[PDB]
Design a protein around this ligand. Structure first.
Ligand code: A1AAL
Length: 127
């Protein structure tokens, strides 16, 4: 298949913690983006077969998507908020690497990223 195995959403050897910040990342940040009208291209791994993107995984070697992030949060996979924030940033960075400025998918990502950053601005201090 053109598609690689998707990123793991569990791993018994991965170290993990729960924190108030990770809780906010699920309850606020992920939920807000997940329900947005532009979420759908980002709700699951990029499917190069369905989407006719035979070059996608020649270019994008660190794939990430919000379906994976959602499951990682639900599974308490992360050690800290930074790991989760990094996954969101990988997703956006991949979109801007693969697609051209001004493309519809880029306009969608930019709207989601603006909202992401508005929610991150209110991330509680860890306690
Ligand atoms: C986030 C991953 N992604 C992605 C896309 C893309 O172009 N670049 C990406 O990085 C595709 C895409 C997804 C899910 N995802 C998608 O549903 O296409 C549909 C499609 C399937 C079969 C043939 C041609 C098709 O559409 C032609 C228009 C150009 O495609 C667009 C346009 C707007 C939004 C998304 C996309």
């Amino acid at each position: 298949s053109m598609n690689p195995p998707p990123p793991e959403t569990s791993n018994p050897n991965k170290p993990k913690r729960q924190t108030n910040q990770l809780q906010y990342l699920l309850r606020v940040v992920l939920k807000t983006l997940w329900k947005h009208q532009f979420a759908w291209p980002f709700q699951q791994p990029v499917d190069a077969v369905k989407l006719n993107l035979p070059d996608y995984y020649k270019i994008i070697k660190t794939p990430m998507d919000m379906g994976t992030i959602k499951k990682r949060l639900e599974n308490n996979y992360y050690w800290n908020a930074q790991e989760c924030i990094q996954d969101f940033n990988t997703m956006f960075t991949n979109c801007y690497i693969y697609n051209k400025p001004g493309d519809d998918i880029v306009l969608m990502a930019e709207a989601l990223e603006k909202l992401f950053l508005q929610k991150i601005n209110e991330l509680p201090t860890e306690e």
